[PDB]
Scaffold this active site. Structure first.
Site, PDB file in Angstrom:
ATOM      1  N   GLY A   1      77.111  35.695   1.339  1.00 16.79           N
ATOM      2  CA  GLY A   1      76.387  35.268   0.125  1.00 16.79           C
ATOM      3  C   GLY A   1      77.201  35.521  -1.131  1.00 16.79           C
ATOM      4  N   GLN A   2      77.227  34.567  -2.068  1.00 18.51           N
ATOM      5  CA  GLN A   2      77.963  34.718  -3.353  1.00 18.51           C
ATOM      6  C   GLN A   2      77.056  35.463  -4.336  1.00 18.51           C
ATOM      7  OE1 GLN A   2      78.216  30.452  -3.594  1.00 18.51           O
ATOM      8  NE2 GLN A   2      77.577  30.477  -5.736  1.00 18.51           N
ATOM      9  N   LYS A   3      75.817  35.775  -3.939  1.00 14.10           N
ATOM     10  CA  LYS A   3      74.882  36.568  -4.778  1.00 14.10           C
ATOM     11  C   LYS A   3      75.598  37.850  -5.191  1.00 14.10           C
ATOM     12  CE  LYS A   3      72.004  39.016  -2.444  1.00 14.10           C
ATOM     13  NZ  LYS A   3      72.947  40.134  -2.679  1.00 14.10           N
ATOM     14  N   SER A   4      76.180  38.576  -4.233  1.00 11.51           N
ATOM     15  CA  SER A   4      76.944  39.821  -4.497  1.00 11.51           C
ATOM     16  C   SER A   4      78.425  39.555  -4.225  1.00 11.51           C
ATOM     17  CB  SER A   4      76.421  40.961  -3.665  1.00 11.51           C
ATOM     18  OG  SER A   4      75.067  41.237  -3.988  1.00 11.51           O
ATOM     19  N   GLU A  50      80.425  31.072 -10.233  1.00 13.07           N
ATOM     20  CA  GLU A  50      80.969  32.260  -9.585  1.00 13.07           C
ATOM     21  C   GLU A  50      82.463  32.395  -9.851  1.00 13.07           C
ATOM     22  OE1 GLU A  50      79.482  34.629  -8.391  1.00 13.07           O
ATOM     23  OE2 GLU A  50      77.460  33.947  -7.877  1.00 13.07           O
TER      24      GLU A  50
END
Ligand SMILES: Nc1nc2c(ncn2[C@@H]2O[C@H](COP(=O)(O)OP(=O)(O)OP(=O)(O)O)[C@@H](O)[C@H]2O)c(=O)[nH]1
Ligand SMILES: [Mg+2]
Lengths: 1112, 431, 174
Positions: free
Chosen positions: C59-62, C95
């Site tokens: 995930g690019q969330k974190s 991102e």
């Protein structure tokens, strides 16, 4: 249309510049203004590539050719050659001496020339050591060719060896290059057969003919050790092994372990380490056995330099000896974690374990002890003076955890990580060091990555990253509650915090732990109230001072947490805490008083903890009503507020604040026989003492009692309010004896405001709350403190009473605006607005920001809109509501341009002008400049109109006449008036004879400088008088007469300053004196002594008077 | 025997320290080797304050030398007196802080500091009665801005009962072309003001102006600025290395020259100021020096002591001169009924007398004031900081290391409070 | 010294690296392993004597958290992008603009491994370059490397250049 590359660029930004400096050096050498600046610029340019010196690797060919071509010139002087080596040294500094030197010439035609070059170099020359340092390193690289010196052939190895052995005892930096030279020259196949035994004998003799007391001997031994180490490193196993025992035997009598030199011990440890490997094939060697015992003893070195070398040696040696002798090395590492050892041994053992793990020299059987060994290291902490040791050990253990994680496979580290998962998450959040938390978080992330499947790993990874951990205040509170939600990270954290951090030596850590336990208890009522609350009630009576302070706060927080959890379900507090806890908490003050613990410096923490506990218990409604414990708490609170002067000022306000907060909770908790009323006896008793302590000579006691009265509830003040208000007003006033008590008046106004906000407003009830009958007296008392300018040796401390007065007035206005707006009169509101505007233009940058904020808060308000705001329509334009958070009033450059516009309004022209006067003339240079600029920019529209300028001058003269004999405004106003009459603002009044603006002003000026000893006032008056010369008529005759009288002043400096100012005012202006009369006057002014006998000064004055036609 | 341990950090702090050591060594009569060949007994009566008796009468400086890159440590090692320094006192790294506070405070510098704590403990264990410490670095650098604010915090946490003195050097755009100068200076001031007993600011802008205009120079160098800094430091440490009736050691000084804890910055000076080489021009008199010293021209800080108020002022007269003459001179200066009255000279001044004159003169006087005019440079540094903070340009370099805007805001709020306090005590007078 | 010195010596001797491979496609990432030899696995490779460290995130969330730690730091980033996809590209652009920032010296290397190109409406190299803002990226060397499931080639020189750029920076033994 497949793969494309990005727009690249050269990394070296100063290319043309560097080469341009490298091509202009034959003109630089010769002077110290062209060689010091040119070489200073090269150093700065080279400092921009110290972290990444690899970017300059492509530029290591032309930079060297542009210098070698000049160095290899017989026609160039010596200053240019030494300058060439100076520049070359800076290049080797950045890159290094193990790669950049591999590009210089290394042919056979560069041996004799270099050898002769070095021959002339005189060691006695500190102004050219770089040359020799570079030559010693260049000659060593030349000794790496397969050629034989026999073809070149008092010999060449007799000249090169003597020069190399000469720099082995020097103290300069060249001693390091000598070792490299001797190691690269003796290890040759034709030099190690005719001269490898002589050097060994020389080194052995020098190691014995030296001592650690002399200075030269230390350097000689250091050089010999470095040379021997380099030889053993760059020496084959079939050449050094024979002489490996004699060197070790000679080194043991050096007794390096017992000395006072860290470098010598480091060199000896490294040499014995290298020897140990020399014996072992790429144990049986007796030396290797001894080599071992040496490194483990070295792991106890009291320096953070030799321990790393010892660990590296223990790690490398074990990788050669078989597993029969390797189980011994690991066994010793584990013996270094014994309880009867210093943290240095623990750090050494951790380093050894990390080396073994990174080198794979460890079996799964040893992990059983490594797990417990690393678990004890993370919780290592011992007291020692005003600090505590334990950072390095835990950091080392964290580094060990990471290395083992990156080494073995996930399956081989399943139990290890499964067991350490609980120790890293604790040491990564609730730690006092930031680096340790970061290392623990990194290790946990690394273990979670390779292991992949980890129960609740991604959550702890995202919640605890490298940046989130950095904030220890959010770690104990924010990160503390997130991880606590997991059922496998609850009791381990609570018990850890209760055992380690509530009895810490730092008070901040104990406070953070207590604050964290308040939230951690919400997710565990049963455990916290069944197993934890009992242990904390047992630590309250311990000989440790900090332990009790921490346990009291822990219990106070747990009580409030259990009260919240009970109120959330509408249940009492006894359901959680049994009767035992209730009886124990009530018997704390009694025990603390029976042992006489409220004495000494340590008594402050005890009182603070007791007050916090009492407050938390009163805010939870406990069954203590009608009990001597309440009387004891009241007595303690009364004693604390009375003995505040003895407490140090560094921690004096916190105690008083805690006492005030606890008293407000205690009365509102127990003093209430029935709803709406309270026990008259206790109320009367308390009111008696409070009305007999505000007249206490001490100021701290008065402040404490005032803040206590201000924090009382509303129901307690019912029926007796006119007396409390009168007492507060009398306290806020000043008397001949009370002058230096600004904090008292501040706290009085604060308490008055708090009481007014608490009681609110009630119609037909002056005793119950504030009404339209006593509001006038309250306003008169609040406005009486605005004219407070206490000027002691602590600065203007009247600002402390001005700020509080404004804060109280704002609160009173906001309160009366929401209830019975008729109380807010028009004249009172106008006076308040004028006073607030006066403070919005002071000299202090910080005092001006709060004033502007209060002004904007009072103006912008429609809930409901305030009545009687002067020029309300005009000020809405001056201050847009969408520009509040965009004007830094603390900057005088952004505050003057706006506040000056208020002068246009007749209402905001007196107070604003008075406030700008003190700022226009002052001491600060930046503030005065900005104020003068704003004034000059504002006058551009009120000079051609004689009506506005006339009124402005009239108001200015009226203000000048009202603060006469006052020094807080007279001198600044004199400088201001001068700042304006020189700018030529009133040039519309110089066309009048005896102009009034000038007549009255001149009379007022001589009405202020009469018998003036303050030389500053005299100078200001002298400067102001010369400005009135532009006004013709009798005003110009009066000014001349006044200036003439000051020429015979008692002080000599004034007699000269007046003449100096006259010499300038007569030349700047014109039409003042006759052209023929002007030469004589200038000549007399330039031919007069105003610092000599007044016998001649009086005659010179009479001469000028007769020449100018002025009687005396 | 009151000992004073010295510490050196950064390139500017390792260049001034060596020069000061070489300077004082030419007054206590010590030669490069170590032996003593003086001609007066008043030099050995207080030599242990910065030296230690060794075998053979060899006096050794108590100096710790620290940098994050090697070059500076390499230079002093091959100096005219680099052989008088203990070879185990030199500790350093192979990578600097790149003019970044975090690079030398929360990362690279946070490791080597442990080695500096062992050396400090070893040096303190030898002293029989430790007093305080000293430090010299720069605020315009990255290793002398963050790695020296860490050592002070460590010495305060481990030795809260010891005195701490510093000699910060405020950077300039005329001597340096660095862009993040305001950040490091503010971050260092945020830490010094909280844990420091005394501070001696040295403006690189005032020295440059004095070397350009007064001394008449076309392209001054760091040699001209250091020549005056070395003189001022020695003129200031005259009552800590020589006898005298005005007995006042580091602790007594901090108790007298610093009434308020927060207010502790001074404004050192020295006169007459001259360039290298030529120095012995003429033998100045007492009144000439009494007027040359209070001259703002002869101030190492670019401010204006006149516009303000003097809190604590002192004087250390040097050369052959009796105290009676100095007292008579100061008497007429503090009297309005005399032609020798001046308006720009403080009244209460704790003067002193010394027999040993300086090196290059027979007369010289040091000025150790504490006027409120210093607030000027403080307010100047805040404007330069806000000039770039509003855009947060080049701000992601510090946040990516571990810091946060909260620290910068707290530092700004503390500096504003300090400026407000300085402006408050500008009307403090008994009336 | 002590810690950083040993870390640098190890990184220079053992020739270790660290690649932060991200992406929106799971099939596109599997092809990278076939050549080199929210979720979180640490799989250490050994291609061309380089002891790489393939850190693949889910995930690019974190991503800030997986960009640097207390010991080592990230040296590369193999972000995978879908050409046919046009809706979830703004997230990738954001991102890349947030993570990759400006620095005084060089920075990590990027390689936008674009997969699935034979599909209709596939954006060409320059198109996806302009869709992500790769001309406003300074302090970083970049390359867009296509990949098609039909032909399946033109992947060797991209990885070769990536390795040559990641090695010529830190590694300097030869
Ligand atoms: N007066 C004076 N200032 C100097 C001297 N050398 C450097 N400076 C000042 O020092 C500041 C820069 O700090 P440096 O001392 O070079 O840096 P450092 O502490 O070694 O730090 P890093 O470069 O971060 O490793 C600038 O303001 C320079 O003007 C010097 O010899 N004299
Ligand atoms: Mg440096």
């Amino acid at each position: 249309e497949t793969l494309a590359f990005g727009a690249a660029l050269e990394a070296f930004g100063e290319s043309a510049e560097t080469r341009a400096l490298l091509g202009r050096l034959r003109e630089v050498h010769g002077g110290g203004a062209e060689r010091e600046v040119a070489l200073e610029r090269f150093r700065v340019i080279m400092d921009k590539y110290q972290e990444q010196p690899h970017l300059l690797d492509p530029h290591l060919e032309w930079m060297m050719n542009l210098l070698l071509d000049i160095v290899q010139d017989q026609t160039s002087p010596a200053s240019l050659v030494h300058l060439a080596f100076k520049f070359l040294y800076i290049i080797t500094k950045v890159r290094g001496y193990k790669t950049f030197l591999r590009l210089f010439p290394h042919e056979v035609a560069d041996v004799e020339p270099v050898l002769d070059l070095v021959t002339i170099q005189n060691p006695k020359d500190h102004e050219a050591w770089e040359t020799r340092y570079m030559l010693l390193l260049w000659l060593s690289v030349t000794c790496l060719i397969p050629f034989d010196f026999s073809r070149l052939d008092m010999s060449i190895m007799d000249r090169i060896l003597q020069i190399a052995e000469s720099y082995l005892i020097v103290s300069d930096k060249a001693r390091d290059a000598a070792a490299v030279l001797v190691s690269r020259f003796i290890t040759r196949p034709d030099v190690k057969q005719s001269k490898m035994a002589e050097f060994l004998d020389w080194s052995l003799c020098n190691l014995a003919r030296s001592s650690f007391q002399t200075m030269q001997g230390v350097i000689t031994m250091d050089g010999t050790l470095q040379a021997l180490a380099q030889i053993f490193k760059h020496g084959k196993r079939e050449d050094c092994l024979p002489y490996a025992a004699t060197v070790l035997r000679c080194l043991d009598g050096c007794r390096l372990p017992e000395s006072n030199q860290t470098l010598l011990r480091k060199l000896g440890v490294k040499l014995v380490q290298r020897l140990g490997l020399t014996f072992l094939k790429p144990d049986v060697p007796e030396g290797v056995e001894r080599v071992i015992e040496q490194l483990l003893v070295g792991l106890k070195d009291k320096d953070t330099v030799v321990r790393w070398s010892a660990a590296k040696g223990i790690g490398r040696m074990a990788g050669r000896l078989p597993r029969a002798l390797a189980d011994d090395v690991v066994g010793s590492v584990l013996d270094c974690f014994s309880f009867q050892e210093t943290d240095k041994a623990w750090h050494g053992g951790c380093l050894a374990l990390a080396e073994l793990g990174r080198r794979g020299l460890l079996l799964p059987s040893r992990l059983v002890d490594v797990v417990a060994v690393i678990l004890k290291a993370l919780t290592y902490d011992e007291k020692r003076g005003a600090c505590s040791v334990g950072t390095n050990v835990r950091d080392a253990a964290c580094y060990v955890c990471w290395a083992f994680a990156r080494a073995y496979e996930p399956q081989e580290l399943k139990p290890f990580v499964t067991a350490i998962s609980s120790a890293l998450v604790i040491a990564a959040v609730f730690d006092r060091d930031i680096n340790c938390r970061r290392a623990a978080s990194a290790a946990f992330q690394e273990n979670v990555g390779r292991q992949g499947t980890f129960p609740h790993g991604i959550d702890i990874l995202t919640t605890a990253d490298y940046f989130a951990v950095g904030n220890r205040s959010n770690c104990f509170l924010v990160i503390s509650v997130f991880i606590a939600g997991f059922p496998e990270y609850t009791q381990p954290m609570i018990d850890h915090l209760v055992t380690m951090k509530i009895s810490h030596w730092d008070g901040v850590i104990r406070e953070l732990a207590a604050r964290a336990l308040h939230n951690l208890a919400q997710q565990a009522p049963e455990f916290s109230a069944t197993q934890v609350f009992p242990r904390l009630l047992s630590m309250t009576l311990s000989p440790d001072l900090h332990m009790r302070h921490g346990s009291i706060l822990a219990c106070a927080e747990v009580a409030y947490a259990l009260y919240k959890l009970a109120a959330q379900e509408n249940r009492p507090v006894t359901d959680h805490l049994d009767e035992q806890a209730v009886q124990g908490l009530k018997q704390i003050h009694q025990q603390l008083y029976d042992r006489q613990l409220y004495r000494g410096l340590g008594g402050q923490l005890m009182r603070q903890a007791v007050c916090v506990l009492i407050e938390k218990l009163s805010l939870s409604k406990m069954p203590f009503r009608g009990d001597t414990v309440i009387d004891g708490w009241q007595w303690l609170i009364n004693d604390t507020l009375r003995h505040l002067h003895l407490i140090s000022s560094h921690s004096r306000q916190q105690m008083k604040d805690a006492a005030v907060s606890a008293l407000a909770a205690l009365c509102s908790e127990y003093y209430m026989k029935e709803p709406g009323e309270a026990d008259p006896a206790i109320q009367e008793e308390l009111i008696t003492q409070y009305l007999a302590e505000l007249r206490n000579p001490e100021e701290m006691t008065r402040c404490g009692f005032s803040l206590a009265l201000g924090a009382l509830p509303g129901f307690l003040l019912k029926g007796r309010l006119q007396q409390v208000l009168t007492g507060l007003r009398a306290v806020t006033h000043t008397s001949p004896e009370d002058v230096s008590f600004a904090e008292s008046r501040r706290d009085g106004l604060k308490a008055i405001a708090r009481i007014c906000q608490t009681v609110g407003v009630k119609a037909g009830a002056p005793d119950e709350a504030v009404c339209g009958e006593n509001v006038s007296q309250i306003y008169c008392a609040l406005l009486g403190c605005m004219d407070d300018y206490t000027t002691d040796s602590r600065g203007d401390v009247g600002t402390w009473v001005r700020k509080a007065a404004m804060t109280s007035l704002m609160d009173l206005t906001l309160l009366l605006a929401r209830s019975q707006p008729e109380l807010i009169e028009a004249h009172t509101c106008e006076r308040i607005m004028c006073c607030v505007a006066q403070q919005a233009s002071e000299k202090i940058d910080r005092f001006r920001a709060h004033a502007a904020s209060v002004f904007l808060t009072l103006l912008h308000f429609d809930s409901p809109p305030i009545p009687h705001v002067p020029h309300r329509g005009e000020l809405e334009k001056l201050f847009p509501r969408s520009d509040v958070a965009s004007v830094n009033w603390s900057a005088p450059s952004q505050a003057f341009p706006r506040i000056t516009q208020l002068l246009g309004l007749p209402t905001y022209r007196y107070h604003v002008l008075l406030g700008l006067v003190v700022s226009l003339g002052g001491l600060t240079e930046s503030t005065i400049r900005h104020s003068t600029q704003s004034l000059f920019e504002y006058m551009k529209g009120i000079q051609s109109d004689p009506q506005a300028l006339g009124s402005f001058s009239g108001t200015l003269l009226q203000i000048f006449e009202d603060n006469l004999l006052n020094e807080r405004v007279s001198v600044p106003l004199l400088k201001t008036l001068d700042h304006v009459l020189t700018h030529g603002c009133f040039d519309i009044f110089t066309t009048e004879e005896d102009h009034p603006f000038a007549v009255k002003l001149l009379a007022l000026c001589k009405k202020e400088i009469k018998n003036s000893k303050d030389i500053q006032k005299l100078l200001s008056g002298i400067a102001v008088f010369c400005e009135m010369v532009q006004f013709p008529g009798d005003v110009r005759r009066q000014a001349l007469l006044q200036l003439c009288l000051l020429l015979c002043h008692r002080f000599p400096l004034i007699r000269k300053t007046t003449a100096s100012q006259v010499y300038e005012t007569l030349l700047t202006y014109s039409d003042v004196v006759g052209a023929d009369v002007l030469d004589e006057v200038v000549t007399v002014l330039s031919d007069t002594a105003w610092d000599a006998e007044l016998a001649v000064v009086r005659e010179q004055r009479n001469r000028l008077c007769d020449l100018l036609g002025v009687p005396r | 025997m009151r000992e004073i341990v010295h510490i050196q950090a950064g390139q500017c702090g390792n260049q001034i320290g060596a020069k000061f050591w070489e300077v004082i060594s030419d007054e206590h009569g010590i030669d490069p080797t170590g032996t003593y060949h003086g001609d007066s007994d008043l030099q050995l009566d207080r030599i242990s304050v910065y030296y230690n008796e060794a075998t053979g009468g060899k006096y050794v400086p108590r100096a710790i030398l620290v940098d994050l890159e090697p070059g500076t440590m390499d230079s002093v090692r091959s100096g005219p007196f680099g052989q008088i320094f203990r070879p185990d006192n030199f500790v350093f790294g192979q990578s600097g802080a790149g003019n970044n506070w975090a690079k030398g405070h929360y990362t690279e510098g946070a490791e080597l500091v442990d080695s500096v704590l062992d050396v400090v403990r070893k040096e303190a264990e030898s002293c029989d009665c430790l007093q305080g410490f000293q430090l010299t670095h720069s605020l315009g650098g990255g290793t002398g801005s963050g790695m020296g604010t860490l050592l002070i915090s460590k010495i305060r946490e481990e030795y809260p009962d010891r005195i701490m003195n510093t000699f910060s050097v405020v950077p300039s755009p005329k001597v340096s072309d660095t862009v993040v100068e305001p950040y490091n200076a503010t971050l260092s001031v945020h830490q010094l003001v909280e844990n420091t007993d005394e501070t001696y600011c040295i403006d690189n802008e005032a020295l440059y102006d004095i070397c350009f205009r007064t001394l008449k120079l076309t392209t001054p160098t760091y040699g001209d600025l250091n020549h005056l800094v070395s003189a001022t430091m020695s003129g200031v440490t005259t009552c800590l290395r020589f006898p005298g009736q005005l007995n006042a050691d580091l602790r007594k000084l901090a108790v007298n020259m610093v009434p308020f804890p927060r207010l502790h910055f001074f404004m050192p000076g020295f006169a007459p100021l001259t360039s290298r080489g030529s120095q012995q021009y003429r033998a100045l008199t007492v009144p000439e020096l009494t007027q040359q010293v209070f001259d703002a021209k002869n101030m190492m800080a670019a401010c204006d002591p006149r516009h303000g108020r003097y809190l604590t002022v002192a004087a250390v007269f040097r050369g052959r001169m009796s105290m009676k003459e100095v007292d008579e001179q100061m008497l007429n200066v503090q009297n309005k009924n005399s032609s020798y009255f001046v308006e720009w000279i403080p009244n209460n001044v704790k003067t002193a007398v010394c027999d040993i004159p300086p090196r290059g003169l027979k007369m010289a006087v040091t000025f150790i004031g504490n006027s409120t005019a210093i607030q000027e440079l403080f307010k100047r540094i805040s404007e330069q900081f806000t000039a770039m903070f509003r855009r947060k340009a080049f701000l992601h370099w510090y946040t990516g290391e571990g810091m946060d805007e909260m620290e910068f805001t707290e530092a700004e709020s503390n500096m504003n409070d300090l400026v407000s306090e300085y402006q408050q005590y500008q009307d403090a007078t008994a009336e | 010294m002590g810690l950083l010195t040993i870390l640098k010596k190890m990184k220079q001797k053992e020739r270790e690296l660290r690649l932060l491979m991200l992406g929106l496609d799971n099939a596109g990432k599997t092809t990278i392993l076939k050549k080199f030899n929210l979720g979180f696995n640490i799989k250490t490779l050994e291609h061309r004597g380089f002891k790489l460290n393939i850190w693949d995130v889910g995930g690019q969330k974190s991503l800030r958290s997986y960009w640097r730690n207390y010991f080592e730091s990230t040296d590369g980033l193999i972000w995978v992008v879908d050409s046919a996809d046009r809706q979830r590209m703004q997230d990738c652009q954001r991102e890349l603009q947030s993570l990759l920032v400006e620095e005084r010296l060089a920075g990590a290397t990027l390689l936008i491994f674009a997969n699935k190109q034979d599909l209709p409406g596939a954006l060409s190299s320059n198109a996806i370059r302009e869709v992500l803002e790769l001309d406003s990226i300074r302090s970083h060397h970049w390359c867009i490397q296509g990949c098609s499931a039909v032909t399946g080639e033109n992947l060797l020189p991209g990885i070769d250049w990536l390795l040559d750029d990641i090695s010529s920076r830190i590694f300097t033994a030869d």
